[PDB]
Amino acid sequence: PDQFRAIIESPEGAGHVGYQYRRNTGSTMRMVSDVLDERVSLWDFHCDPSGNVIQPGPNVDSRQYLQAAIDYVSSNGGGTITIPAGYTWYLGSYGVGGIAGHSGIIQLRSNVNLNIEGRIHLSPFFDLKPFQVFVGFDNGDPASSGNLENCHIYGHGVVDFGGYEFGASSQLRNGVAFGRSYNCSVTGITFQNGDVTWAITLGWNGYGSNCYVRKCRFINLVNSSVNANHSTVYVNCPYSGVESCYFSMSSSFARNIACSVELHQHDTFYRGSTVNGYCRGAYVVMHAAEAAGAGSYAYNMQVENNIAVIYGQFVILGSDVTATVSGHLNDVIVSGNIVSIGERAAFSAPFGAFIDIGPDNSGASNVQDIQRVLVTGNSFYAPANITDSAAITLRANLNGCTFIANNFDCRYMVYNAPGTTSPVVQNLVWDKSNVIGGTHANQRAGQNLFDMQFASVVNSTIEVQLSCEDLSMFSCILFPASCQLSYSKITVDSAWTKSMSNTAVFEGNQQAGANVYVSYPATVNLTSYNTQGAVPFFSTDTNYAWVTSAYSLSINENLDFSPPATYTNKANGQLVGVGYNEIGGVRSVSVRLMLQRQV
Amino acid sequence: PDQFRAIIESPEGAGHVGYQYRRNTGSTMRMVSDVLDERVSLWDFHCDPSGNVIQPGPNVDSRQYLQAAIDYVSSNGGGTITIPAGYTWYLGSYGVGGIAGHSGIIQLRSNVNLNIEGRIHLSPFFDLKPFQVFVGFDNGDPASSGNLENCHIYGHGVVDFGGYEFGASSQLRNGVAFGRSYNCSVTGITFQNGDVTWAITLGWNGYGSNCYVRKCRFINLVNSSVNANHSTVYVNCPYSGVESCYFSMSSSFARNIACSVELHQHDTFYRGSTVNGYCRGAYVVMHAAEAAGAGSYAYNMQVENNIAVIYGQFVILGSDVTATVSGHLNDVIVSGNIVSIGERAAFSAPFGAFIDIGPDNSGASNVQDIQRVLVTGNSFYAPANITDSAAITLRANLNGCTFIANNFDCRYMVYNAPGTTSPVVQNLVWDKSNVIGGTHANQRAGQNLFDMQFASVVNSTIEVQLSCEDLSMFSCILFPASCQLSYSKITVDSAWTKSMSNTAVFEGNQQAGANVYVSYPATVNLTSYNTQGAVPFFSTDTNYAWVTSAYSLSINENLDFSPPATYTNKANGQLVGVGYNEIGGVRSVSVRLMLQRQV
Amino acid sequence: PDQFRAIIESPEGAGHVGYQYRRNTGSTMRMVSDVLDERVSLWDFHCDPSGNVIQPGPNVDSRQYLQAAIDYVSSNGGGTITIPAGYTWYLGSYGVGGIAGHSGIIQLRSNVNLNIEGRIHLSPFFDLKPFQVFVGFDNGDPASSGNLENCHIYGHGVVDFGGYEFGASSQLRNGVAFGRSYNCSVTGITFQNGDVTWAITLGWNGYGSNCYVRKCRFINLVNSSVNANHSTVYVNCPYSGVESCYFSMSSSFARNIACSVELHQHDTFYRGSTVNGYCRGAYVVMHAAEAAGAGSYAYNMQVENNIAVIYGQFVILGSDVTATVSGHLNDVIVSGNIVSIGERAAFSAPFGAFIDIGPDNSGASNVQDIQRVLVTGNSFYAPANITDSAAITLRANLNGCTFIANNFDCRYMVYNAPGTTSPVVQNLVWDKSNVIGGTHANQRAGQNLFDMQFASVVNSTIEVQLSCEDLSMFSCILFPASCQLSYSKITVDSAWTKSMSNTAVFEGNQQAGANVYVSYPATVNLTSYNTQGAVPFFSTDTNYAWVTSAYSLSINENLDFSPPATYTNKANGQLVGVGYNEIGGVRSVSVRLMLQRQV
Ligand code: NA
Ligand code: NA
Ligand code: NA
Ligand code: NA
Ligand code: NA
Ligand code: NA
Ligand code: NA
Ligand code: NA
Ligand code: NA
């Protein structure tokens, strides 16, 4: 009996108190400790060497306790550790072993989930230092790392990076690096208050699968000029993605350096998220340097139904090569996104774009293999002052991209800066169902709406359709003489173009090519013969040898004659058609025509 | 030892029984009470003054117990209170203090989540009375209220409003009012069986952020003629939304009064939901009266990938003004929705529409500032008998709206009732990729498919394309003489129009305007001169002074001559072209032409 | 006191140890057993007849214990049973009673949820036998079954089917059959390693509502040639769907037999999912045989924003009839999907398609009633070698289907095999905004891009637009003489067609029909009269009696004359136009024209 009181007060006491669920005679006859052992929290490991519980706080380093918890639960085949609500748990030292090569704090282990209901904060030990808060690699060399499987982090809690700036631009900082990660996820968590490189990374160079970030918040994760670059989630394994997240930055530096998501492997997605205050929406890129685990192709890439206010580019496409591997990007869909460039001065952040075809990280524009991309059903808006805003900035070689049924309301439709790169363009398709807005009407002095500053364009379609006037622009579409153009279709619808001096401009006369199909409006001066009755009219100028037919876009204010309704050409480059002189006389008129070639 | 038995049976007993997790020697030496204290339920507060547990039931008011639980957990920095499964917990009185001004039952508190696994019912004390079941305001005056932060309500449970009708139309009833709410959400819950104004409201006049309703059900929440108006979720803070919910009504009154969602602040969404039995899908509105917390602009508004059977309008757009604030709506996307008007008689519910540009709550149509809206990739269907069905009912001033690649199968495409409002319309864009269905073919006697009953139309595009015949309609598009039309493009594709007497009708001759670009089919009678050889044909009528060119849509059944293939005009308003008389003679023919002006 | 030690060690011991939450004097004075009774796990029933806990393992059949748990919790109004993490729980026998008719293992009960954190495996007792692991029917005859309501299965755990092959093709195997299921769901679970017919089925012949599968994984669920057919989720009740799931197969048999989802009742969806290794994406079908619970119409069907690599067809549409019921499919949207046919030889799996209009299960093609379908904003790709790849394989009667703003990059656009079925086609709409890719350029010898192998086509639109050349194809569009064509619009844009011998081909001369509206390019030889001045040119051939106008697509390399720019016809079927002879002489030219009829 002495001994009984002793047992009951001992740590084995609950193991002596019987329990049967709801007094049910068919239930297991258990002990209290058995039922308590079905759950586990940080409190079960957050104790001193004598087993006395330690209270968390700014002057307590919780790291070793949390690691002990993870280690122990891992040893039993897994489970879920709760990080209790109503407490802030500070981390105040680096981890040891395999994660030290990654500046790791906590090592994640397979099947061991974390339910973060309270707050995890970084203590000032980490000020000006690199860190990766949770790491799933088990080796300093990721190539020699084991996998992390079935690890979920979820809850209503918070990871707070303590506000600390980077100490040097070369440093790396991360929230969760799942590593070579298979069926891992983060759900519900708020990441906030730091200066970091990534909040979450999924996979490693294509090793991993089925990793997701869902219903998380990322708030104020860049705060300094030291921060070299920030991408909030970096998706580096296939069959993985980001859904229904919220991303916000307030720093000025974030407007120049921060991107919300990167998709770097096949069968990856970015959907249903809201972004504010970032430079960029998403990179969609196949790096040859990352091709080890899942091949050299990024395909089935999806960016859909997101909402964004950014300062630079919404989606950036890329692929590149190494000495022995070539990366390819194909089968991409960008749809349903509503995006705007936030209020800013022209040229005060990276050049505004809905899509950017960017050069590689060395600036090379002749290594890319990007094709079979569909951009459909998106809206884009930039305020009227933002000269540096385009539907697509096409700055590197492009093997195809298709635009259907978007609404683009910005300075340029297609742009690339002259005397920069000279991309080779194939299979650029701009369907007539793309609606060109009018916010930048009157701002386009000296500018071409479609500024085709490329080395060459083949197998491309540009069907221009205005929906309001903008007589300030120099042309709707212009090809410099250095841009070859072949096997293409280029049309300018006449609506809102009557008063334009230039509609389509071919500075090398490239619309003459055998397999170029074009149409655009032009003003033409004609003169007739004197004959009464059916009578020819001929253009005064001889620059129409390429024209297959033309037809009037002007009314005839005369009674005594009419010019031809339709024209063909002659070998000397004149247009010619048959009009009617009710009364004879040489006539001379200036008419707006629709010039057509092979259409 | 006497004393030990006593301690063990006392309420401090579990605090004397030791426990160490899984017998792990490195785990904390705790007491049973410590582990039990990691969770909390309603049972921990649902007790009489002596501490004896009280069973819930229809004759027990659970309100004070649940409030006590919330209050206590709030005092510890938060946590999650479970509302146990297998019990119905009745609420039978009003709350006190700050929530009394809101007819509040329970006051929510920051960081205190509710996991509702059982059922919460309203007792008949609430019959014919106002109530707001859960309220996050802490003051009767919302302007003087504190915030609610980090409050989540979730579970497999149920909030049941007891079936009670409203007592007076002026009363308000709500399920959850989060208040000035930051990172709050409702997930998984079924709201059912009532007559209420809202089930959930998020935010207050733009104060709040990151509030969401996800995977909830709302069933039968209007049941009486007294109910003035019902909107199931009212989103009144930015960076907030509704995703993957189910909404159903069976009441006849709901078909006239109920809307599923309202989006009232920037960066808000409504996605992936299913609606049946409601009048309306969503309001997307910037009320000046609600502009305090987040500015005067609603932008980045998203309605996507929903499924609906409604009786009135799917999306209703609006903005309005007060004495000192002006509200603006811009940058909206409506995409991927599949919607139909349910079976009903014509005019038996509010006028059926996919989009409605509605007047303000006072009926004013000259205060709105709505622009940069994209409606793309949606389907809409109304049964053939529903005369009052339109793709857009445009009833108030519109500063722009763009339709691309939709499928609209209803009575009207564009409509506004004559002798009602006379909206000023700018930047209405109806792309040719909008497919017009054929359900209402043969029903359109006396009606114009595009009925342009506006004060004026500028910078607009209407590209009509039929996909089957409907010879019952009076015209494809008609402009009354009171509607000014300028700087616009209006086209009628000829397919399925050969037999139409009227295609495009300009009752004020507005197609003559200098910057109007049109084309449409017409039948024209021509007569030739007698000359053998090339010979002019001239229209008998003189109403073509606006025509820039025309071309034949008819075959020539003659051998001895041919009419012109193409025509221009003359100053007297005749058309003229050059045909061919193999043999001489005056000819007289009636031809279907495509009339063109500046296109 | 003797007696006290005894009570404490007994199974009623925890019922004698007092507890009050956090020492709060206003909290309930409870006993430890009360707090433990708030949760329940399998361990509470996994015991021998004496109440001693049994360890799970390969040689322990856990079935009776899990059933006992479900039964008991059901008796208390429900709750959630945990299936503990860190253990595999084997099932090794069949259930008894109502579920025996369904080869059921476990019977689900209303309000009793399962939180599966560990693993559930099938023992080899099930090798070569039928089984349905969890069944919600309570009767062997589903027609006499009660309902299952409010049953959720969720967690990070796993259902493993043990790898066992089917014993006979006629056998059925399933993971979860919810039965006549109302507010039931599966969330988070991994189904893997089997040879089964379905993983999950929702509803029964239209009985059920609000059933969902969310964030689950289905991995390797076909493994044998015996397996007759596999569809991973079969949705057989309305207001139900599949969201954000992952489906993968590696078996060769799956490429021929497996589909990811079937939608079989109204108001159902399939969204945001990733599929690899399957034959098919989704069936969307109204079976008359399944019309009992929710009517004879499947409407509001949504397939959106999915990512797929399949070997056969992405979406298959269907409806059929029984002796007394007729099934109808209408109001369908397919949008935002990015799909490809995986690498395979031509004809090595079922014919590749984005959409298939399939015959019924008996092969009948004259029973379907499918209409009001919108296919918009999708991408589809098949590798160049896959002859058997189409945007739509149209193999049964079709009452309407609309394609807007897709990107299809495969061998055929519209296809049906000749001398197979002869479908009746109405309201097939192929908008010009559909972009036709170029992967299969040069592969189309002998083939028609749009191969119209139908009994008849009415009220249809085909607007062909190429975006690169493919001179290998026999035609862009061909109608055999056996296909009637009326009240339709068929156009071939001229871009990339100059060198094509055949563009549109009407083998029965059907383009002559009164209400056929067409345009396409053709080469025509003309001869003029000798007259100096305005002079007629006439076609040598007489096959143009149907032509309403034509215009030049060729330049004029002559100085001394010009052919007409535009032409009409004459009764003998010649074309005729007026050109100009600067000098006299009979001229003879070959010109590319755009032939037009009523457009
Ligand atoms: Na490192
Ligand atoms: Na493409
Ligand atoms: Na060049
Ligand atoms: Na009030
Ligand atoms: Na717009
Ligand atoms: Na007016
Ligand atoms: Na059976
Ligand atoms: Na349709
Ligand atoms: Na036939």
TrEMBL record, chains A, B, C:
Protein name as annotated: Tail spike protein
Coiled coil (residue ranges): none
Location in the cell: Virion
Lipid metabolism among keywords: no
Keywords: Calcium, Degradation of host cell envelope components during virus entry, Degradation of host lipopolysaccharides during virus entry, Glycosidase, Host-virus interaction, Hydrolase, Metal-binding, Viral attachment to host cell, Viral tail fiber protein, Viral tail protein, Virion, Virus entry into host cell
Organism: Enterobacteria phage HK620
Keyword S-adenosyl-L-methionine in record: no
Whole-protein residues included: 112 to 710 of 710
A molecular-function term among this protein's GO annotations: endo-1,3-alpha-L-rhamnosidase activity
